[PDB]
Design a binder for this molecule. Structure first.
Ligand SMILES: [Zn+2]
Lengths: 514, 75, 337
């Protein structure tokens, strides 16, 4: 369809999450925690209570929410699922992206993993479920090795969760259709339809031999299923609002649940009515990852809509009450600190500067043309600061801003990218002459300044920061190709740019003509 | 802001607008999405039919406000 | 020769759009009594909305008098029994100059203009009285309270908007036969918003999938159903849909209500349009007699008002023409039982 150019205004290193965390993976051999950030960055942390700075690395390739991650191959390989419609394959030890799968056509929401087959599956809002052989994915070229997919059909609505068993013999999807759908991943054959839930199902777990399934649903219930009988064998109503996250011990006898009501419970499957409040988190729980160092898990890591990630200890579980008031725990055992998200954005009348407000009520002033921050203004009044900087000037709209990652993402579209002519003098530039500059055209040239095909470097008036992410996407989300501005001179990047840069950008950046 | 529009089939579509946008802008955005001429459109908000020349803030239309699209069955 | 005691309405030059809804308003339960009360308040205290109330009382009395003139000695009249509503047309021309001339117009649009102006009168007289039931006229007869629920499927936050409504804008076909149950469900039932048209969750700060539902909260005495008997392709470009819905006699909005009720509504009036295009056509009305003076030979039958003309059609014979043709339904009026 119609191809948009975007870029992110940010620092070269974003040490802290800038948004909530969608998913968690624990490498037990290296004591490393992976977080899948809503800020589009995956980060590796050390979980040694020794280290003063648990940050290890950021893995920067996605353009939107990272919704799920799966550590494969004894921690060598990470696979990620994002709202940018892609699945990416990472070297988890060195922290770089190796391949990008683009078979999904909407937000990819869930990943599933069959350890014994090195099989992963992806599913999203497009109602598709693709199956991927992990050993098959490392494809350097089209002759030595083309990656191939296999997919399942039947989902009548957007898929929100997905699980496989360890043996890779059962796969289950959860969706807004309120039925769980089951296939054999080996044959892609439909096996059964599990009916019972009255709302979306965002959490799924299978036991080791794929004979029982636990589902967590926005209707507030947890349901246990027998796959041999194709029926529900127990329903648990331990939450007040939607259940979004489930974990289970190795024995498949205690289930840990969390969701919108922020409360996290451990409930015994053999005696449902006895449930224990482990803690109440500070924000809706999105995902939980048990620490499995010991059979009775010593701790549980919890991801929420906040940028902080808390580890809660479990030492002291040996109750009676069905609706406990007092949480078992009150303070996290470890805390990985997060940063603020930009939650409000106003484009000024000059169509050049932006005022932001973040979750700390801090206000900043940015230069869209130079792709950078200008000054932090502290905790001033946001609307009073807007009215204070009002200038009676009209410039046609020529970009759009989005806050989906918590950082500033600027998008250019062919329809209005070239709408804003300004004079060199009023834009603060100097060569001398004072001709008329097109803002979108100069920016496009700065974004592709390192692309050799644009040479005869840059636009002659300003540069963007070299680390600026440059994104080529389809209208309404779907990323085609993403690179950093400085990397355009690469052999891989120049080939991929030639394949992805739309002719309406080529016109300005290559042919040098409006 | 994002407003809702109930089309002739009963299907809801979203429109990105601003409070200072005139009703003519909204009808032109519906023409972009539904191919219906603006002079042939009739838009109801909470029982009140919108008039050209006025803006969305004149009718106190906010985010998640629903406009109902109909036509003029002249007889 | 076989003349009827019910009064028609002269066509003054493409004014069947006005005559159709006026004949429906006359037969609405509280309308006649209500405009008399609003006339009696303006007659005490005190142009614009006041003139519209007087014009409405001028016509209603003119219709009531002409019927009494016929019931006294019907041998005075031959093959016609109708009155002209010129004062109401002139005030409407002053309220909206589009009604000037003699062009064709939408019946729903003129009903909205009349009811909306009467309500402005009620609210203007509420202020002039309180500064020093009647003014509840439009609100208890035709107007209802709607509840539009939007639920982000990401965070499951459910926001709400209360909007008033006087009719229920309803689709006729999808783009074999669709019932009215289907059609109201297209309006009110859950509608998932997905794909290249995603809801923007301000809490999530992200485009998300959403579930939208509309619920009826406060319901009035008359439920108006406004059918969208037309569609567009983009090819003047627009077209009428001649095939209508399967129209029931009894209606209940319990399944789309905010709270369980046992209120059932009964169809009593239908406004129809005849023509292949939207640009022009012919409006008529059809009204069922229900509930007081010796005229009970007709109770249960359907009177058809075609401008100055008026017929009596049978319950079964009219009901067949209402569903799949000649004229096609455009408005449906139900009333509480
Ligand atoms: Zn949300």
């Amino acid at each position: 369809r119609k191809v948009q150019v975007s870029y992110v205004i940010r620092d070269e290193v974003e040490k802290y999450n800038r948004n909530g965390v969608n998913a968690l993976q624990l490498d037990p051999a290296l004591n490393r925690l992976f977080t899948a950030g809503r800020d589009s960055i995956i980060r590796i942390w050390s979980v040694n209570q020794h280290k003063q700075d648990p940050y290890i690395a950021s893995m920067e390739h996605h353009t939107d929410w990272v919704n799920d991650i799966v550590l494969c191959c004894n921690g060598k390989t990470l696979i990620s699922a994002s709202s940018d419609t892609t699945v990416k394959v990472w070297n988890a030890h060195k922290g770089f992206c190796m391949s990008t799968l683009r078979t999904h056509k909407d937000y990819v929401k869930a990943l599933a993993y069959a350890k014994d087959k090195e099989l992963v599956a992806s599913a999203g809002l497009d109602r598709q479920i693709f199956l991927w052989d992990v050993n098959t994915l490392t494809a350097l070229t089209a002759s030595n090795n083309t990656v191939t997919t296999s997919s399942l059909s039947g989902n009548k609505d957007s898929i929100y969760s997905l699980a496989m068993n360890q043996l890779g013999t059962i796969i289950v999807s959860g969706s807004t259709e309120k039925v769980l759908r089951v296939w054999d991943p080996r044959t892609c054959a439909k096996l059964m339809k599990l009916k019972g839930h009255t709302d979306n199902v965002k959490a799924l777990l299978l036991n080791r031999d794929g004979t029982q399934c636990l589902s967590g649903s926005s209707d507030g219930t947890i349901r246990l299923w027998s796959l041999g009988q194709q029926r529900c064998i127990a329903t648990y109503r331990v939450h007040d609002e939607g259940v979004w996250a489930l974990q289970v011990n190795d024995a498949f006898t205690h289930v840990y649940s969390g969701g919108r009501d922020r409360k996290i419970y451990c409930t015994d499957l053999r005696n449902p009515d006895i449930r224990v409040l482990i803690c109440e988190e500070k924000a809706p729980v999105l995902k939980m990852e048990l620490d499995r160092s010991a059979d009775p898990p010593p701790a549980i890591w919890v991801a929420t809509t906040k940028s902080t990630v808390n580890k809660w200890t479990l030492k002291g579980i040996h109750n009676d009450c069905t609706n406990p008031i007092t949480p078992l725990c009150t303070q996290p055992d470890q805390v990985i600190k997060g940063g603020a998200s930009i939650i409000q954005c106003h484009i000024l009348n000059d169509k050049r500067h932006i005022l932001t407000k973040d979750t700390n009520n801090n206000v900043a002033y940015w230069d869209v043309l130079k792709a950078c921050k200008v000054e932090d203004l502290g905790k001033v009044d946001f609307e009073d600061e807007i009215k204070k900087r009002f200038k009676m000037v009209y410039v046609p709209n020529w970009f759009s801003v989005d806050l989906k990652t918590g950082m500033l993402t600027i998008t250019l579209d062919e329809s209005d990218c070239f709408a804003a002519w300004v004079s060199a003098k009023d834009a603060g530039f100097s060569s001398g002459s004072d001709p008329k500059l097109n803002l979108g055209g100069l920016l496009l040239q700065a974004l592709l300044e390192y692309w050799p095909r644009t040479h005869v470097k840059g636009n002659g008036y300003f540069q963007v920061p070299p680390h600026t992410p440059v994104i080529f996407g389809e209208a309404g989300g779907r990323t085609l190709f993403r690179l950093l501005c400085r990397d355009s001179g690469g052999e891989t990047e120049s080939m991929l740019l030639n394949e992805t840069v739309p002719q309406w950008v080529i016109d300005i950046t290559v042919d040098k003509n409006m | 802001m994002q407003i809702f529009v109930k089309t002739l089939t009963g299907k809801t579509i979203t429109l990105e607008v601003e409070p200072s946008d005139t009703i003519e802008n909204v009808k032109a955005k519906i023409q972009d999405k539904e191919g219906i001429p603006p002079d042939q459109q009739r838009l109801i908000f909470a029982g009140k039919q919108l008039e050209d020349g006025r803006t969305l803030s004149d009718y106190n239309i906010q985010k998640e406000s629903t406009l109902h699209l109909v036509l003029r069955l002249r007889g | 020769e076989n003349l009827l005691p019910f009064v028609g309405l002269n066509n003054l030059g493409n004014t069947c759009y006005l005559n159709s809804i006026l004949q429906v308003l006359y037969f609405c339960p509280g309308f006649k009594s209500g405009v008399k009360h609003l006339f009696n308040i303006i007659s005490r205290k005190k142009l614009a909305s006041y003139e519209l109330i007087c014009s409405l009382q001028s016509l209603i009395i003119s219709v009531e008098q002409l019927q009494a003139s016929f019931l006294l000695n019907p041998e005075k009249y031959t093959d016609e029994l109708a009155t002209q509503p010129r004062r109401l047309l002139n005030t409407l021309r002053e309220l909206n100059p589009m009604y000037e001339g003699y062009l064709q117009h939408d019946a729903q649009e003129v009903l909205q203009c009349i009811l909306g102006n009467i309500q402005e009168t009620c609210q203007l007289l509420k202020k002039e009285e309180v500064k020093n039931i009647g003014f509840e006229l439009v609100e208890k007869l035709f107007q209802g309270q709607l509840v539009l629920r939007t639920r982000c499927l990401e965070c499951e936050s459910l926001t709400e908007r209360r909007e008033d409504f006087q009719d229920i804008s309803v689709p006729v076909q999808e783009d074999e036969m669709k019932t009215l149950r289907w059609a109201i469900s297209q309006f009110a039932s859950v509608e998932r918003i997905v794909g290249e048209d995603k809801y923007f969750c301000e809490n999530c700060h992200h485009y998300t999938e959403a579930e939208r539902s509309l619920l009826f909260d406060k319901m009035p005495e008359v439920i108006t159903i406004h059918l969208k008997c037309f569609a567009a392709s983009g090819l003047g470009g627009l077209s009428k849909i001649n095939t209508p819905l399967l129209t029931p006699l009894k209606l209940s909005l319990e399944e789309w209500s905010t709270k369980p009720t046992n209120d059932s509504y009964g169809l009593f009036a239908v406004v129809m349009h005849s023509g292949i295009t939207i640009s022009s056509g012919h409006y008529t009305a059809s009204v069922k007699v229900t509930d007081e003076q010796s005229l009970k030979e007709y109770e249960g039958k359907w009177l058809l008002f075609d401008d100055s003309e008026v017929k009596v059609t049978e319950e079964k014979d009219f009901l067949n023409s209402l569903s799949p043709p000649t004229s096609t339904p455009y408005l449906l009026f139900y009333k509480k039982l």
